[PDB]
């Protein structure tokens, strides 16, 4: 899997939440919706790669947000890859969604499908406009809002690892869940609640899991997602959108290959995929 | 030989086993569940081809998870598949609302996330399975077969368990005619690396077109014809194109056949998604399939979104319409919209 170009577009609005799993993260405001950030992120990647929308073979989306996806803020399905196809004019593409997958796992699976089918230009997009999810005020956990676009050329050569979190090996980590709001009264109310129990050692356990997984490919430089503010400068973190600056630094430094590592809060694992770089 | 060296070969993909699990209770077209639906008529019922359909009964322990556990355990046992030999589990569920996580997350009730594969892998003891949850609405069974096949072909998995579980009834607005056709059900299939050429996925073609994305959606809204203090819910919603779906499934089939180097005359049998008799017939006529080469199965099940195709495949195998050695085409449409077709050489498929 070769990364041709990266696009990223985050809201300018940051919100700080206290708690062991808190931090300062980008947060969409008002009735901002995901497409207003996703479309410019995608166009930035296509422009960098000199790839026209009609040349896109495949669009695969990742977005948990249950509303505020598109102009009609009440639509949850079909998922955002489809309206993206429409507004982009990617009239030859196949579209699907990999729901709560990590980006690393999605990139591995898509490298496999797309190389097998002979595709040349594949868009993997990740975004949130999470106004419809209640943050976890007990732990401080919230999703970062924004959009990340990876324009990729498949090779079928990407390698993959799914690894344990670090820290106490006898620690049972309690996963993220998003229960449905059982008391929706107005169409604009939250549709679900983020629930990630307060676990003070979790941010460090994730980072230790990253470092362990990176040891499977010691020859490779690597990039990673930062879902928590703990121990980060100013408590600021961008979740999976942290990957954009790291990938761009790798391009500036003319790296040809790298390892990309995701944190999956549902599985409480880390997942890595090896990549080529333009 | 062609070269002094040996050419690499993609692994053959065996469709090894399949089963389905449907709701215990069936609802006829005059069932009181439809008492608040307006504008019904015998012409409506006769047109869509559904005479009865099933909805999960969660009060009696039926839901998208429990019936999958039952079906998958049955298939693993019947196919003699050790849980630890499954390398990947690919699940789909078109309703965003899940309701049960078994013994894995026993306190979780209605939920948007997580999806199914990770919790199901733990419930079934699939200790080596990479879990994936994919979404292509009514074409998800085909998408999952395609994902599985590519993993197997490239040597990245040797056994892949595929699950589709449709709890669509938890999104249906029963004050609206939109509630009258869709229905619940589950399907499980096992794909493996083939040990001979008796079975393989010869080719597939997937494509999407979002021109009419807004026509068929899941939207947070009040009921169409509410009563009292109705609350907003996530509902299947239909907004107000004639030839779009009739033509695009044949487009996908023609592309898949071309990639396989075959024509429709080379195909023994066809398996279609089951949205309506007129649509299945239009797809068949668009590719040259005669009525003796496919079944209409929505009459007694309703339109089970992604489960219609695997149910219809299973029916054809069970009834002897599809035989070992047959070449078949499986094809359907999905909201979004998406289209998928697959050309299979089938061997012996275990129906369990």
A95 neighbourhood in chain B, CB within 8 Å: 208, 210, 336, 338
| Helix A81-88 and helix A35-49, axial crossing angle in degrees, nearest 10 | 60
The verdict on B179 and B219 lying in the same domain is: no
B219 and B144 in one domain?
no
Domain membership flag for residue B6: no
- Candidates B135, B268, B145; CA nearest to A100 is B135
* CA dist., res. B299 & res. A12, Å (int): 53
Q: What are phi and psi of B8, to 5 degrees?
A: -65, 155
Residue with tokens 């695997």: B310
* Shortest CA distance from B97: residue in chain A: A180
Instruction: Using the structure block, give the residue that is written with the tokens 């395609």.
Output: B146
CA distance B214 to chain A (A): 8
Tell me which DSSP letter residue A236 carries: B
Angle at B127 between CA B168 and CA A141, to 5 degrees: 65
B129 in Cβ contact with B159 (< 8 Å): no
Sign of the torsion angle spanned by Cα atoms B118, B121, B127, B129: negative
B149 and B84 together in one domain: yes
* Cα B310 → chain centroid: 6
Query: To probe the interface with A, which of B107, B149, B220 has the most A CB atoms within 10 Å?
Result: B220
Q: How far is residue A213's CA from residue A259's CA, in Å, rounded to a whole number?
A: 10
Looking at the fold, whether B238 and B190 belong to one and the same domain comes out as: no
Same domain for B171 and B27: yes
Single residue among B200, B229, B250 that ends a domain in this structure: B200
Q: Do B95 and B131 share a domain, yes or no?
A: yes
d(CA B222, CA B333): 28
CATH number of the domain that B168 lies in?
3.40.47.10
Q: Does a structural domain hold residue B302?
A: yes
B147 shares contact with chain A (CB less than 8 Å):
yes
Burial class, A127, CB count within 10 angstroms (exposed 0-12 / middle 13-18 / buried 19+): buried
- CA–chain centroid gap for B96, Å, is 16
Chain B: nearest CA to A257, how far in angstroms?
21
Concatenated DSSP letters of B168-224: GGGG--TTSGGGSSB--EEEEEEEEE-SSSSSEEEEEEEEE--TTGGGEEEEEE--S
For residue A86, what are the domain limits? 1-278
Pair (B181, B259) in one structural domain: no
Q: Could you tell me where the DSSP H helices lie in chain B?
A: 42-48, 66-78, 117-124, 140-153, 244-260, 277-287, 308-318
Residue A128 token pair: 């949130």
Q: Which residue range is the domain that position B276 belongs to? A: 201-351
Kindly state whether residue B90 falls inside one of the protein's structural domains.
yes
Report the run of H or E that residue B19 belongs to, with start and end.
Answer: strand B13-21
From A99, A156, A176, residue closest to B135, measured CB to CB = A99
Among B174, B200, B226, residue at a domain's last position: B200
CA distance B37 to B172: 11
Instruction: Note whether B148 and B176 are same-domain residues.
Output: yes
Cα–Cα distance for residue pair B344/B200, rounded to 1 Å: 6
Could you tell me which residues are beta bridge partners of residue B203?
A: B343
Count other Cβ atoms within 10 Å, centred on residue A207: 21
Sign of the dihedral through C-alpha B308, B314, B319, B321: positive
d(CA B277, CA B297): 9
Closest CA relative to residue B272, chosen from B139, B171, B93 = B139
Note whether B183 and B272 are same-domain residues.
Answer: no
Domain count, chain A: 1
Domain count, chain B: 2
Q: Quick check: helix, strand or coil at residue B285?
A: helix
| Domain-located, residue B80 | yes
In a domain, B1, yes or no: no
Helix, strand and coil percent figures for chain B, each rounded to 5: 30, 25, 40
Chain B: residue nearest A58 by CA? Answer: B207
In chain B, the residue whose alpha carbon lies closest to the alpha carbon of A178 is: B113
> Distance between terminal CA atoms of chain A?
11
Torsion of CA A95, A98, A103, A106, to 10 degrees: -80
Altogether, the residues listed in chain B come to a count of 352
CA distance linking residue B343 with residue B13, whole number of Å = 12
Chain B, window 3-62: residues with a beta carbon less than 8 angstroms from a chain A beta carbon: 10
What six digits make up the tokens of A66?
A: 């249950």
Which residues on chain B are in Cβ contact (under 8 Å) with A179? 108-112
Q: How far B144 CA lies from chain A's nearest CA (Å)?
A: 11
Q: Which of A78, A109, A172, A100 is nearest to B116 (CA)?
A: A100
Inspect the interface and report whether the beta carbons of A95 and B217 lie closer than 8 Å. Answer: no
Which of B200, B224, B256 is a domain's end point? B200
Task: Kindly provide the resolution of this structure in angstroms, with one decimal.
Answer: 1.5
Our CA-based measurement puts residue B319 at a distance from the nearest CA of chain A, in whole angstroms, of 33
Provide the experimental method for this PDB entry: X-ray
Q: Is residue B47 domain-shared with residue B98, that is, in the same domain?
A: yes
Within a domain: B7: no
Q: Kindly state whether residues B51 and B86 are assigned to the same domain.
A: yes
Relative to beta strand A146-153, strand A2-9 is antiparallel
Q: Which of A59, A77, A131 has the highest number of chain B CBs within 10 A, making it the mutation to test binding with B?
A: A77
Residues of chain A neighbouring B234 (CB-CB closer than 8 A): 66, 76, 191
- DSSP single-letter state for residue A243: H
Burial tier of B41 (Cβ tally within 10 Å: 0-12, 13-18, 19+): exposed
A149, A150, A152, A158: CA torsion to nearest 10: -150
Is the same domain home to B226 and B177? Answer: no
């Amino acid at each position: 899997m070769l990364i041709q170009a990266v696009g990223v577009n985050l809201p300018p609005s940051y919100v700080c939440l206290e708690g062991p799993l808190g931090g300062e993260r980008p947060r969409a405001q008002g009735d901002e919706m995901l497409m207003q950030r996703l479309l410019p992120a995608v166009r930035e990647a296509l422009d960098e790669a000199a790839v026209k929308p009609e040349e896109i073979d495949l669009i695969v989306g990742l977005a948990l947000s249950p509303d505020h996806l598109i102009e009609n803020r009440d639509i949850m399905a079909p998922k955002i890859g489809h309206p993206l196809q429409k507004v982009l004019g990617a009239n030859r593409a196949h579209v699907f969604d990999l729901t709560d997958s990590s980006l690393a796992r999605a990139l591995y699976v898509v490298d496999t499908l797309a190389s097998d089918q002979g595709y040349r230009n594949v868009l993997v997009v990740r975004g949130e406009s999470s106004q419809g999810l209640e943050v976890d005020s007990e732990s401080g956990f919230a999703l970062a809002d924004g959009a990340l676009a990876l324009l990729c050329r498949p090779t079928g050569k990407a390698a993959f690892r799914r690894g344990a979190l670090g820290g106490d090996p006898a620690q049972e980590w309690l996963p993220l869940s998003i229960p449905l709001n059982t008391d929706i009264r107005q169409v604009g109310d939250v549709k679900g609640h983020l629930n990630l129990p307060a676990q003070p050692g979790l941010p460090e356990a994730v980072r230790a899991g990253f470092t362990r997984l990176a040891g499977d490919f010691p020859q490779l430089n690597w990039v990673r997602e930062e879902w928590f503010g703990q121990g980060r400068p100013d408590g600021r973190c961008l979740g999976p959108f942290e990957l954009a600056s790291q990938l761009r630094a790798a391009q500036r430094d003319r790296l040809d290959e790298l390892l990309l590592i995701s944190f999956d809060p549902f599985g409480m694992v880390v997942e890595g995929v090896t990549l080529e770089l333009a | 030989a062609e070269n002094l060296y040996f050419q690499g070969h993609m692994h053959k993909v065996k469709l090894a086993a399949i089963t389905c699990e449907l709701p215990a209770r069936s609802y006829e077209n005059d069932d009181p569940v439809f008492a608040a639906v307006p504008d019904l008529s015998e012409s409506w019922w006769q047109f869509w081809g559904v005479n009865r359909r099933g909805y999960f009964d969660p009060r009696n322990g039926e839901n998208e998870f429990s019936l999958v556990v039952r079906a998958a355990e049955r298939l693993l046992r019947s196919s003699d598949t050790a849980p630890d030999s499954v390398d990947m589990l690919i699940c789909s569920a078109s309703s965003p609302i899940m309701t049960d996580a078994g013994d894995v997350l026993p306190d979780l009730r209605g939920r948007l996330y997580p999806r199914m594969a990770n919790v199901l892998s733990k419930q079934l003891g699939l200790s080596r399975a990479l879990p994936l949850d994919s979404q292509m609405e009514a074409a998800s069974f085909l998408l999952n077969l395609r994902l599985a096949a590519s993993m197997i072909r490239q040597g990245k998995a040797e056994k892949v368990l595929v699950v589709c579980s449709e709890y669509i009834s938890n999104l249906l607005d029963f004050t609206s005619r939109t509630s009258t056709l869709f229905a619940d059900g589950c399907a499980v299939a096992l794909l493996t690396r083939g040990d001979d050429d008796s079975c393989d996925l010869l080719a597939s073609a997937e494509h999407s077109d979002a021109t009419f994305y807004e026509v068929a959606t899941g939207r947070w809204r009040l009921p169409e014809n509410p009563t009292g203090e109705a609350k907003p819910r996530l509902y299947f919603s239909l907004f107000s194109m004639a030839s779009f779906v009739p033509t695009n499934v044949p487009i996908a089939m023609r592309r898949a056949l071309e990639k396989a180097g075959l024509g429709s005359d080379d195909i023994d049998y066809f398996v279609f998604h089951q949205p309506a008799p007129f649509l299945v017939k239009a797809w068949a006529e668009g590719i040259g399939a005669r009525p003796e080469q496919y079944q209409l199965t929505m009459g007694d099940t309703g339109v089970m979104i992604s489960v219609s195709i695997p149910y219809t495949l299973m029916t054809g195998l069970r009834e002897g319409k599809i035989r070992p050695g047959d070449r078949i085409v499986m094809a359907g449409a999905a909201t979004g919209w998406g289209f998928a077709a697959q050309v299979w050489q089938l061997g012996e498929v275990l129906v369990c």
